[PDB]
Design an enzyme around this catalytic site. Structure first.
Site, PDB file in Angstrom:
ATOM      1  N   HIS A 265       0.801  -1.233   0.000  1.00 24.36           N
ATOM      2  CA  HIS A 265       0.000   0.000   0.000  1.00 24.36           C
ATOM      3  C   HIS A 265       0.831   1.280   0.000  1.00 24.36           C
ATOM      4  O   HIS A 265       1.567   1.540   0.953  1.00 24.36           O
ATOM      5  CB  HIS A 265      -0.926   0.040   1.230  1.00 24.36           C
TER       6      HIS A 265
ATOM      7  N   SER B   5       2.067  -0.835  -5.168  1.00 24.18           N
ATOM      8  CA  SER B   5       1.091  -1.060  -4.104  1.00 24.18           C
ATOM      9  C   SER B   5       0.528  -2.471  -4.234  1.00 24.18           C
ATOM     10  O   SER B   5       0.506  -3.048  -5.321  1.00 24.18           O
ATOM     11  CB  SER B   5      -0.032  -0.018  -4.155  1.00 24.18           C
TER      12      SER B   5
ATOM     13  N   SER C  22      -5.607   1.377  -2.359  1.00 23.71           N
ATOM     14  CA  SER C  22      -4.960   1.792  -1.112  1.00 23.71           C
ATOM     15  C   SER C  22      -3.950   2.936  -1.261  1.00 23.71           C
ATOM     16  O   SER C  22      -3.531   3.497  -0.234  1.00 23.71           O
ATOM     17  CB  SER C  22      -4.247   0.612  -0.472  1.00 23.71           C
TER      18      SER C  22
ATOM     19  N   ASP D  48       3.434  -7.598   0.869  1.00 26.78           N
ATOM     20  CA  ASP D  48       2.269  -7.471   1.743  1.00 26.78           C
ATOM     21  C   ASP D  48       1.144  -8.207   1.029  1.00 26.78           C
ATOM     22  O   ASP D  48       0.464  -7.634   0.176  1.00 26.78           O
ATOM     23  CB  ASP D  48       1.938  -6.004   2.016  1.00 26.78           C
TER      24      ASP D  48
ATOM     25  N   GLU E 208       4.532  -8.952   5.166  1.00 26.13           N
ATOM     26  CA  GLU E 208       3.839  -8.065   6.097  1.00 26.13           C
ATOM     27  C   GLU E 208       2.612  -8.695   6.773  1.00 26.13           C
ATOM     28  O   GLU E 208       2.374  -8.440   7.955  1.00 26.13           O
ATOM     29  CB  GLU E 208       3.388  -6.795   5.372  1.00 26.13           C
TER      30      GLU E 208
ATOM     31  N   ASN F 230       4.494 -10.301  10.151  1.00 30.79           N
ATOM     32  CA  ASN F 230       3.175 -10.179  10.754  1.00 30.79           C
ATOM     33  C   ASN F 230       3.200 -10.580  12.219  1.00 30.79           C
ATOM     34  O   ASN F 230       2.564  -9.930  13.051  1.00 30.79           O
ATOM     35  CB  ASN F 230       2.143 -11.019  10.005  1.00 30.79           C
TER      36      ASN F 230
ATOM     37  N   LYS G 222       3.757  -5.911  15.649  1.00 28.59           N
ATOM     38  CA  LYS G 222       3.014  -5.864  14.395  1.00 28.59           C
ATOM     39  C   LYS G 222       1.620  -6.449  14.611  1.00 28.59           C
ATOM     40  O   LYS G 222       0.643  -5.706  14.605  1.00 28.59           O
ATOM     41  CB  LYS G 222       3.793  -6.603  13.288  1.00 28.59           C
TER      42      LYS G 222
ATOM     43  N   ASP H 223      -0.701  -3.321  14.762  1.00 30.08           N
ATOM     44  CA  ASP H 223      -1.264  -3.077  13.435  1.00 30.08           C
ATOM     45  C   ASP H 223      -2.600  -3.806  13.240  1.00 30.08           C
ATOM     46  O   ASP H 223      -3.642  -3.173  13.022  1.00 30.08           O
ATOM     47  CB  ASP H 223      -0.190  -3.525  12.418  1.00 30.08           C
ATOM     48  N   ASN H 224      -2.589  -5.139  13.297  1.00 32.18           N
ATOM     49  CA  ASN H 224      -3.782  -5.886  12.905  1.00 32.18           C
ATOM     50  C   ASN H 224      -4.973  -5.541  13.794  1.00 32.18           C
ATOM     51  O   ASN H 224      -6.108  -5.466  13.311  1.00 32.18           O
ATOM     52  CB  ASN H 224      -3.524  -7.393  12.940  1.00 32.18           C
TER      53      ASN H 224
ATOM     54  N   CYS I  55      -6.949  -1.490  12.942  1.00 32.75           N
ATOM     55  CA  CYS I  55      -8.331  -1.577  12.497  1.00 32.75           C
ATOM     56  C   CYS I  55      -9.270  -0.871  13.472  1.00 32.75           C
ATOM     57  O   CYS I  55     -10.277  -0.291  13.052  1.00 32.75           O
ATOM     58  CB  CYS I  55      -8.719  -3.051  12.294  1.00 32.75           C
TER      59      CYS I  55
ATOM     60  N   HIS J   1      -7.589  -8.963   3.704  1.00 30.79           N
ATOM     61  CA  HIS J   1      -6.648  -8.568   2.657  1.00 30.79           C
ATOM     62  C   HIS J   1      -7.272  -8.579   1.262  1.00 30.79           C
ATOM     63  O   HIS J   1      -6.971  -7.703   0.448  1.00 30.79           O
ATOM     64  CB  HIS J   1      -5.404  -9.459   2.672  1.00 30.79           C
TER      65      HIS J   1
ATOM     66  N   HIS K 189      -4.121   2.565   8.540  1.00 23.35           N
ATOM     67  CA  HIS K 189      -3.639   2.749   9.887  1.00 23.35           C
ATOM     68  C   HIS K 189      -2.875   4.068  10.017  1.00 23.35           C
ATOM     69  O   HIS K 189      -2.205   4.503   9.081  1.00 23.35           O
ATOM     70  CB  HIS K 189      -2.725   1.587  10.285  1.00 23.35           C
TER      71      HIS K 189
ATOM     72  N   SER L 185       5.047  -1.708  12.723  1.00 21.75           N
ATOM     73  CA  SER L 185       5.122  -2.658  11.621  1.00 21.75           C
ATOM     74  C   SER L 185       6.345  -2.407  10.763  1.00 21.75           C
ATOM     75  O   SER L 185       7.035  -3.352  10.360  1.00 21.75           O
ATOM     76  CB  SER L 185       3.874  -2.578  10.752  1.00 21.75           C
TER      77      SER L 185
ATOM     78  N   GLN M  99       9.820  -4.338   9.607  1.00 17.64           N
ATOM     79  CA  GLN M  99      10.195  -4.595   8.214  1.00 17.64           C
ATOM     80  C   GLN M  99      11.660  -4.244   7.971  1.00 17.64           C
ATOM     81  O   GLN M  99      12.410  -5.015   7.362  1.00 17.64           O
ATOM     82  CB  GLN M  99       9.304  -3.801   7.256  1.00 17.64           C
TER      83      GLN M  99
HETATM   84  N1  LIG Z   1      -6.954  -4.072   6.485  1.00 15.89           N
HETATM   85  C1  LIG Z   1      -5.940  -4.050   7.342  1.00 15.89           C
HETATM   86  O1  LIG Z   1      -5.383  -2.997   7.677  1.00 15.89           O
HETATM   87  C2  LIG Z   1      -5.367  -5.367   7.795  1.00 15.89           C
HETATM   88  C3  LIG Z   1      -4.381  -5.434   8.775  1.00 15.89           C
HETATM   89  C4  LIG Z   1      -3.811  -6.655   9.101  1.00 15.89           C
HETATM   90  C5  LIG Z   1      -4.255  -7.797   8.468  1.00 15.89           C
HETATM   91  N2  LIG Z   1      -5.243  -7.716   7.555  1.00 15.89           N
HETATM   92  C6  LIG Z   1      -5.824  -8.959   6.910  1.00 15.89           C
HETATM   93  O2  LIG Z   1      -7.002  -9.311   7.595  1.00 15.89           O
HETATM   94  C7  LIG Z   1      -7.201 -10.744   7.498  1.00 15.89           C
HETATM   95  C8  LIG Z   1      -7.382 -11.334   8.869  1.00 15.89           C
HETATM   96  O3  LIG Z   1      -6.168 -11.068   9.571  1.00 15.89           O
HETATM   97  P1  LIG Z   1      -5.921 -11.529  11.051  1.00 15.89           P
HETATM   98  O4  LIG Z   1      -4.540 -11.178  11.458  1.00 15.89           O
HETATM   99  O5  LIG Z   1      -7.060 -11.088  11.903  1.00 15.89           O
HETATM  100  O6  LIG Z   1      -6.042 -13.118  10.912  1.00 15.89           O
HETATM  101  P2  LIG Z   1      -6.488 -14.084  12.085  1.00 15.89           P
HETATM  102  O7  LIG Z   1      -6.100 -15.498  11.744  1.00 15.89           O
HETATM  103  O8  LIG Z   1      -5.885 -13.635  13.371  1.00 15.89           O
HETATM  104  O9  LIG Z   1      -8.110 -14.010  12.192  1.00 15.89           O
HETATM  105  C9  LIG Z   1      -8.976 -14.456  11.133  1.00 15.89           C
HETATM  106  C10 LIG Z   1     -10.129 -15.085  11.882  1.00 15.89           C
HETATM  107  O10 LIG Z   1     -11.196 -15.394  10.968  1.00 15.89           O
HETATM  108  C11 LIG Z   1     -11.857 -16.529  11.480  1.00 15.89           C
HETATM  109  N3  LIG Z   1     -12.664 -17.100  10.414  1.00 15.89           N
HETATM  110  C12 LIG Z   1     -12.213 -17.791   9.314  1.00 15.89           C
HETATM  111  N4  LIG Z   1     -13.165 -18.194   8.515  1.00 15.89           N
HETATM  112  C13 LIG Z   1     -14.331 -17.753   9.127  1.00 15.89           C
HETATM  113  C14 LIG Z   1     -15.686 -17.865   8.782  1.00 15.89           C
HETATM  114  N5  LIG Z   1     -16.132 -18.525   7.702  1.00 15.89           N
HETATM  115  N6  LIG Z   1     -16.597 -17.314   9.618  1.00 15.89           N
HETATM  116  C15 LIG Z   1     -16.164 -16.699  10.725  1.00 15.89           C
HETATM  117  N7  LIG Z   1     -14.909 -16.518  11.148  1.00 15.89           N
HETATM  118  C16 LIG Z   1     -14.029 -17.076  10.302  1.00 15.89           C
HETATM  119  C17 LIG Z   1     -10.731 -17.418  11.992  1.00 15.89           C
HETATM  120  O11 LIG Z   1     -11.161 -18.366  12.960  1.00 15.89           O
HETATM  121  C18 LIG Z   1      -9.802 -16.382  12.636  1.00 15.89           C
HETATM  122  O12 LIG Z   1      -9.997 -16.236  14.046  1.00 15.89           O
HETATM  123  C19 LIG Z   1      -6.007 -11.277   6.694  1.00 15.89           C
HETATM  124  O13 LIG Z   1      -6.390 -11.226   5.324  1.00 15.89           O
HETATM  125  C20 LIG Z   1      -4.936 -10.209   6.951  1.00 15.89           C
HETATM  126  O14 LIG Z   1      -3.922 -10.187   5.947  1.00 15.89           O
HETATM  127  C21 LIG Z   1      -5.800  -6.541   7.209  1.00 15.89           C
END
Ligand SMILES: NC(=O)c1ccc[n+]([C@@H]2O[C@H](COP(=O)([O-])OP(=O)(O)OC[C@H]3O[C@@H](n4cnc5c(N)ncnc54)[C@H](O)[C@@H]3O)[C@@H](O)[C@H]2O)c1
Ligand SMILES: NC(=O)c1ccc[n+]([C@@H]2O[C@H](COP(=O)([O-])OP(=O)(O)OC[C@H]3O[C@@H](n4cnc5c(N)ncnc54)[C@H](O)[C@@H]3O)[C@@H](O)[C@H]2O)c1
Ligand SMILES: NC(=O)c1ccc[n+]([C@@H]2O[C@H](COP(=O)([O-])OP(=O)(O)OC[C@H]3O[C@@H](n4cnc5c(N)ncnc54)[C@H](O)[C@@H]3O)[C@@H](O)[C@H]2O)c1
Ligand SMILES: NC(=O)c1ccc[n+]([C@@H]2O[C@H](COP(=O)([O-])OP(=O)(O)OC[C@H]3O[C@@H](n4cnc5c(N)ncnc54)[C@H](O)[C@@H]3O)[C@@H](O)[C@H]2O)c1
Ligand SMILES: CC[C@@H](N)c1ccccc1O
Ligand SMILES: CC[C@@H](N)c1ccccc1O
Ligand SMILES: [K+]
Ligand SMILES: [K+]
Ligand SMILES: [K+]
Lengths: 463, 461, 462, 461
Positions: free
Chosen positions: B53, B76, B81, B131, B156, B181, B186, B190-191, B195, B315, B374, B382, B386
């Protein structure tokens, strides 16, 4: 009770009241009662003889009667002089179960109770399992009764401090039986250690003092699982909570959680001098809570500098987090009511009843949630204690003490339960709230690389 | 005479540079790495392909890598993004960057390719920063020879890490990786807290809807789902949480959320009768957070309350069945990255139809699509990781090893806790926090060094 | 067809604005229920309303409800930065006279108000006034008194405007009766508090994109706006301190879990640098003014603030902050529209990399409207349903047609009756899907109310 | 040989006195008044009948009234609210008090009449302090000649104020009253924040139930309902709110609660068909907060989820139809003020029956019955107002005025805002808060004195 005299409790006539509360707690502990129903017929603990040392609460009662329902004999004591609920001890003793426990033991009596579990009629009981919370019973066996460990298949240890002691013994080659670290199941550490203290810390402060908390200033020492839950316990009541930590990762979490991170010492440097104390900070604090499992994190110089009429308490396992010994030597203690003392900083012999310069100490610095209230609620302890039952079944069925030497060497370790069991405990807890867990489709399970049945996360996952 | 880039508008550069100067004051861990390593130039000779991004925060990351000796070519990892002023400032500093907000799918692949190719030939890259795993995949599948020159990949996000671990398991991963990650500074910063900050931010920017008092359904309760649920709960939404993981579901309950399934008995059999329509008919906002596929499916979309908002902060945009909606329902653009989806049919729409949903960022990462993702002070953690991961792998020079030694070195690892703690300490000081120092007696009492690490590697925080 | 009686930034934004009006109507059930109930009765037929209030999408729905009820209007914004240009364009494209754009100069601001007052170079035959802050009311009384002879009333939106009306009533200078719309509970304890809870952190994120969690804020004021502002920041995890002159409001801040502090040592503002609590202000990352008072973030406070602190105002007028001191002494660097770095190193230029600056949002003007879009539609629903009811009431009472003796008896500043406040709230609750329970006859008698309400005595504070 | 009292156990007095000495340091407004007025003795000659919860906090109020010159005779206004050590300390100080925790209804009336009567004849009372109007009612109905000597009533709570206003409307109120409830430092402190502190406190002490993650229904959202809903929501309960007042219901929605009715479409037609059985079958805890009658009725109690907790924090127990439960279901005492109500029938119960409800304090005020009510630092505001109200009415000397002047003053009034502000200022200082002083220019700008009052009487805070 009948000719059964193999117990010591405050008052056996509290037994019926204890039974009433046990029947309620059973309805609050679906994971534990699920194991009772699943395994009753198979009797997986038939022949187990369990030395148990853990706070003799109503929640522990349900644990004890689950082990017995699965075939075990037990002999029980509390792991803290103040944590017993006397109606719970009475109900267990009235059920014919050896228990030596009451609220308000002396230190001598605490040691005596543990020895009464170890000895039956003056000789070692033929124990073969240990359930411990903090390592005191584990330590007494290794030091004073090493022969007994020759017949013991394992130890299931409840809490962070106990596990630390086990790992030091394993490293030193002085641990004699394998252990299961019950604390580090997610349905224990991130349930009991955090959410339990959230429920029970402000509960005990209210029962002990009836102080308004909203709008007042707290300092929480530590931000591990207990410090996280304790800080939330106070913040949700409206306290202005500051947090101290030595771990910068935990300190980072406190910042992002919305807390100001401070140290009792200028620039964080604890050099043992009064000059190192941030007296301006400590002079503003209405409540200090220690959560560290460390030693002397509320020290003499901090106690001297605290705001007048501040409350001081400890929710870590042992009372040496606060320098209560300094207060015993120098200041006059005035009992308000059981487990609540005003500590008069004006001197040692006598006090003015209307003196304004005192601190309020809860539970004489012992675990405050158990000393001044009832510890964690049944529905939280359900998770911890379902893990304990699973840990006891696993180690007893392994039969470590009967294995050949080479097999013993491969199993002499400190392990956690497999994540699949952690998840099965969690699932019953969720159903107890009426939550509905979604089932993955085969394609979804393939997409994230798990079985539809779980485990759903790698062992590296932190939740 | 620098021309080796493509951005939306180069004249946004001075605006970008103003925001870069501000963001630097918000990223002390990352800026601290500039001062600590500048003298030593640990990335001298590194040639980094970067795909993440193209925000202001990524700009500070890029210029930290360059400040330590690296050359880079950047793109990106998502079509919506990019902050166009960030991409302009980077291009104007002489750095190859190929990114703009609102790329097509073809432009997205083209941009990655422009990092891989310099003057029509593969660049002499020896490091990768990714990422989500798209750049990593293109290199393994389309330019495998470049991997013989690359010392490692620093990945990432959770989804990209999963893709790497599939390859390590299949024995098809060609260079070692650092799972960035899973540093605590991180994953649990971040995660989750990212959010928390940026989900309600994007929803306000995209719709300006009041959230207080309305009903939300969050799919997932991992780190992103926890942060997203808090983002909504702190605004006064009534949040419900769906999970397939009973441990995460347990945390949701204890955190004060009702745990529900879109499906009766939680069984997703593919039918409309499986849908809890009473539940879906009450939901004002659904947010997907899983990193899984089709967790907001067509029957859920059919059952949703009229004028509900639908968005995704995982993602990839296949968490929501947007393919179903493109095929069956008419899209009315409100403004960029905000569409009303009219469930009355595909053949046009009534301008005053009441039966529509509002989709944000076409189902792409909503926090980056409709806001700015973020904040700098969070991305500081994060991106400090890196930088450290890039030095960690570059200094080990995997690509120079013989085959038998590479096999022993080939892995996907996290950074040691000691680095995670060092990042965290810089973050805490940026808040003005004061960490306490253990006494010798205290360190011995809990069995750690006064300098840390303060926790065993098993610790979950 | 040939409509030119408007001035907006860009008429081609009309279609966009109309898309957002159609969405906002679905978020405003109380106002749209008034539109449905009253459109055939035309209760505002013959009303000629001068309107002065932020030209947002929400104001657009209000404007078109008044027109749907029969009124003609001529409109301007009550702030130089609060207009949404797509809302103004949509209203102009509907053939409604509107004079408003985001980023007006002070001279342009006054010009727009006078374009509502004058039509074809002559006073419009206005007979109603809807105001937000009192600027239109003030211009009419000072510069166009003869127009007030024909005006039946003023409906005033906001706390500051109401205070100016009450001043005039005490002094004998108020010429027409007013309804205090602010003090409906569905206005004051909805708009002023929850509105700012929604929109204050919204505007700070859009202007700065700063992380708020873990940082220190000082909110000056703890009335309805200060309560909602403090919550906007605390719910993001800011460490929030509150200043107040009112001990009852200060008591609430303490009970709500905030530390109550003064920028001045012992709370004594002697006008010197030495009275500033420098240690306190040196820790503050964000200061928000919410008071409706003057110079509550003063020059000495501004000098003592932590480097790179954010400074903003969510009270009605910009003089809460001493921006004039900053214009006189410090160099301003625009980051982007409505966001300035103020360099405390001097007036004549600045180092682009200087670290000693403050970030000022919206040049000190109402930050939620200047840097974001103000309150959301579902909140403004309550405020603007009250405005429509108030307009109908004063228009139907026809004060301008009374003899002098009767005007004197009718000249007052009043609130709407509680039964209407409750009816507004009921539609808001239905919009959430809430279900209000109905008393049984015996329950109603037990607590001494009619089954249909009102449910509280007029003394009740909620 | 002081014997003119009746308490559970006089030997608890030393304990009670220790807690009074603590409580005094938590009540700076009330102790401030005690010190301020001691020299003047403004209540010299006052003979006060007091009827209010005999807690430690009430003890500090009683000894303030005596310290200012009053004589008093005291009873509690609830059979469960007395703290026995507080009653003991007051009796051991030579003050007539008739109160213990766990009175019967007949003992409750006996205690009030023991304050009214002295040596077998009506005491020469000239002041009344009441909480809920029971003492006021008995005086008007059974001892009306005594009211000829009484200068006024200072009434603590919402319910008692309503009874005063009904009497005034009907011409049956015989002496003037001050409505202490509606001081801001009472109503928006005691009624709201006090219930926030003490509702979850009582539920924990009575049941030790986890609240996080469970479902609550709060009946009412006035000041007590607002504080109660927050008490439960801050523990992590999923709280739904019922209201008949759409303005209070609007506040609940904006505060992040779902607003629901026990009855389909909110219409209580008295039949089981009107009950929302799906809703009530999911509720783990119901709390009534209304001051109204039968708002948790028999049909709701029949429909509640098995093992739900039922409690009332309004003044009187008839909010819950406990009479229906006494007539139809078997009661099993768990411990004092905690009963299992077995819905299997009237004549006995299975000790292992699963179909029961848990009732706290037999439906009486649960914060006082199962815990200790509001904390001292909250009651400080209420009781400072009580003292000011007693001083004001005793000095007006209504019982001595000629008939036309009585008519002018036969009213229910509140204290002036200036005094409400002065109480609040002492409360703020108790927190270490620093109130800012207006400059003369700022005072002029908003039209107030530098000294206050700072708001018009219309202001709602
Ligand atoms: N947008 C952002 O800024 C940002 C930041 C970090 C990560 N992400 C992305 O967000 C996603 C999730 O990341 P994360 O770190 O929380 O992963 P995570 O593994 O910690 O959590 C994902 C969760 O989804 C649940 N899940 C899976 N399938 C499901 C379903 N059908 N119904 C209900 N729950 C279900 C899993 O049990 C798990 O607890 C990934 O794609 C990651 O790359 C986005
Ligand atoms: N009372 C209860 O019910 C209960 C429940 C669980 C555990 N415990 C006990 O509580 C204690 C803490 O357990 P935990 O699971 O949170 O452990 P933990 O390791 O997660 O947390 C302890 C924290 O204390 C910090 N710390 C150590 N020394 C410090 C110092 N001098 N100043 C500030 N911070 C310092 C550490 O950095 C760490 O983050 C243990 O003794 C455990 O047995 C009590
Ligand atoms: N931006 C918005 O959307 C919006 C919404 C509603 C009202 N407003 C405006 O915000 C302002 C405040 O409105 P309100 O309804 O909260 O009024 P209010 O009277 O309820 O609150 C103002 C508060 O400021 C306090 N105060 C005054 N001088 C002070 C000082 N020197 N230091 C500290 N505190 C001080 C007062 O004691 C009072 O409690 C008014 O100008 C109003 O018109 C803005
Ligand atoms: N236990 C305590 O410590 C304590 C403290 C203060 C007051 N009280 C008592 O609590 C009660 C409430 O006091 P308050 O000050 O909140 O009064 P209030 O008038 O502010 O609130 C009562 C609310 O109940 C609502 N209501 C009435 N009937 C209802 C019904 N059938 N269904 C749903 N909602 C209904 C009303 O609309 C009103 O908003 C009174 O009896 C008062 O004396 C108790
Ligand atoms: C039914 C037993 C089973 N579901 C269970 C498994 C693991 C832990 C607790 C349990 O109750
Ligand atoms: C039908 C209109 C009516 N319910 C209403 C009444 C008052 C205020 C707003 C409204 O929409
Ligand atoms: K318990
Ligand atoms: K808006
Ligand atoms: K109390």
């Amino acid at each position: 009770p009948a000719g059964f005299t193999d117990y010591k409790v405050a008052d056996i006539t509290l037994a019926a009241w204890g039974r009433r509360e046990l029947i309620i707690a059973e309805s609050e502990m679906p994971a534990l009662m699920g194991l009772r129903r699943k395994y009753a017929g198979q009797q997986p603990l038939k022949g187990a003889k369990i030395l148990g040392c853990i706070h003799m609460t109503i929640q522990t009662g349900v644990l004890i009667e689950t082990l017995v329902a699965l075939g075990a004999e037990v002999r029980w004591s509390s792991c803290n002089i103040f944590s017993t609920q006397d109606q719970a001890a009475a109900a267990i003793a009235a059920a014919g179960i050896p228990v030596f426990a009451w609220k308000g033991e002396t230190e001598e009596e605490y040691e005596w109770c543990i020895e009464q579990t170890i000895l039956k009629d003056g000789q070692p009981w033929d124990a073969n399992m240990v359930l411990d919370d903090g390592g005191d019973l584990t330590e007494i066996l290794h030091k004073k009764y090493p022969q007994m460990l020759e017949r013991i298949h394992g130890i299931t240890e409840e809490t962070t401090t106990g596990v630390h002691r086990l790992l030091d013994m394993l490293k030193n080659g002085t641990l004699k039986v394998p252990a299961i670290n019950v604390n580090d199941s997610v349905t224990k550490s991130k349930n009991d250690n955090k959410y339990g203290c959230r429920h029970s810390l402000n509960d005990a402060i209210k029962r002990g003092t009836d102080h308004l908390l909203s709008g007042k200033q707290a300092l929480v020492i530590g931000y591990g699982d207990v410090g996280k839950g304790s800080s939330q316990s106070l913040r949700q009541e409206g306290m202005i909570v500051k947090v101290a930590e030595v771990d910068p990762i935990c300190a980072m979490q406190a910042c992002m959680d919305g807390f100001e991170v401070v140290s009792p010492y200028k620039n964080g440097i604890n050099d043992g001098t009064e000059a190192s104390i941030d007296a301006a900070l400590l002079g503003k604090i209405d409540l200090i809570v220690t959560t560290t499992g460390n030693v002397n994190v509320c020290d003499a110089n901090m106690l001297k500098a605290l705001k007048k009429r501040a409350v001081v308490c400890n929710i870590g396992h042992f009372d040496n987090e606060i320098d209560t010994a300094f207060m015993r030597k120098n200041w006059a203690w005035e009992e308000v009511k059981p487990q609540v003392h005003k500590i008069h900083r004006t001197g040692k012999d006598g006090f003015d009843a209307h003196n304004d310069d005192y601190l309020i100490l809860l539970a004489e610095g012992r675990l405050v949630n158990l000393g001044n209230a009832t510890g964690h609620p049944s529905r939280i302890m359900d998770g911890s204690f379902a893990n304990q039952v699973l840990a006891q079944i696993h180690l007893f069925e392994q039969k470590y003490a009967d294995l050949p030497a080479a097999e013993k060497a491969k199993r002499l370790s400190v392990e956690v339960l497999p994540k699949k069991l952690d998840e099965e405990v969690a699932l019953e807890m969720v159903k107890g709230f009426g939550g509905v867990v979604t089932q993955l489709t085969p394609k979804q399970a393939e997409y994230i690389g798990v079985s539809v049945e779980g485990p759903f996360k790698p062992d590296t996952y932190r939740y």
